């Protein structure tokens, strides 16, 4: 039911034209965090959404990852956060999916990556390949 | 009103 509520709110993105509201992102994030016992399901659901969604929703999907990881690090501590480490497992493939976004959304992904790097959200060995993927597209 | 990748 925790996973059901999260999935419901995540897929509700399909009802809206991006950019997505702060309030909606907050709702999704709060549901993810409440469901921390099921963090593996939460990550799986986010990744599935990003794999399968329309191009206009790739950036919104990335923003869901960013929002969850940022709130989790804030709420539980950077060292104790379980979401960034779990998202890291498939992250190369997740980003391959994300970069299938409209060309005018590509700069938005790079922005997120640059901020993750600045804040050491992921190790360089993860961030650099993701940055390299954006550059190889140009 | 749109989400931005900012600190919570």
From Swiss-Prot, chain A:
Residues 1-135 form the CID domain. The modification Phosphothreonine is found at residue 5. There is a cross-link at residue 17 (Glycyl lysine isopeptide (Lys-Gly) (interchain with G-Cter in SUMO1)). Signal peptide: none annotated. It is found in: Nucleus; Nucleus matrix. It comes from the Eukaryota. Interacts with POLR2A; via C-terminal heptapeptide repeat domain (CTD) phosphorylated at 'Ser-2' and 'Ser-5'. Identified in a complex with CDC5L and other spliceosomal proteins. Anti-terminator protein required to prevent early mRNA termination during transcription. Together with SCAF4, acts by suppressing the use of early, alternative poly(A) sites, thereby preventing the accumulation of non-functional truncated proteins. Mechanistically, associates with the phosphorylated C-terminal heptapeptide repeat domain (CTD) of the largest RNA polymerase II subunit (POLR2A), and subsequently binds nascent RNA upstream of early polyadenylation sites to prevent premature mRNA transcript cleavage and polyadenylation. This is SR-related and CTD-associated factor 8. It comes from Homo sapiens (Human).
């Amino acid at each position: 039911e925790a996973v059901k509520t999260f999935n419901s709110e995540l897929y509700s993105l399909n009802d809206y034209k991006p950019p997505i509201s702060k309030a909606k992102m907050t709702q999704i994030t709060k549901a993810a965090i409440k469901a921390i016992k099921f963090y593996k399901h939460v990550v799986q659901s986010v990744e599935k959404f990003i794999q399968k969604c329309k191009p206009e929703y790739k950036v919104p999907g990335l923003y869901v990852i960013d929002s969850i990881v940022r709130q989790s690090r804030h709420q539980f501590g950077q060292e104790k956060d379980v979401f960034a480490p779990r998202f890291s497992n498939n992250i190369i493939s997740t980003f391959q999916n994300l970069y299938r976004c409209p060309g005018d959304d590509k700069s938005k992904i790079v922005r997120v990556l640059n901020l993750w790097q600045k804040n050491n959200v992921f190790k360089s060995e993860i961030i650099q390949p993701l940055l390299d993927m954006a550059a190889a597209l140009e | 009103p749109s989400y931005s990748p900012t600190s919570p």
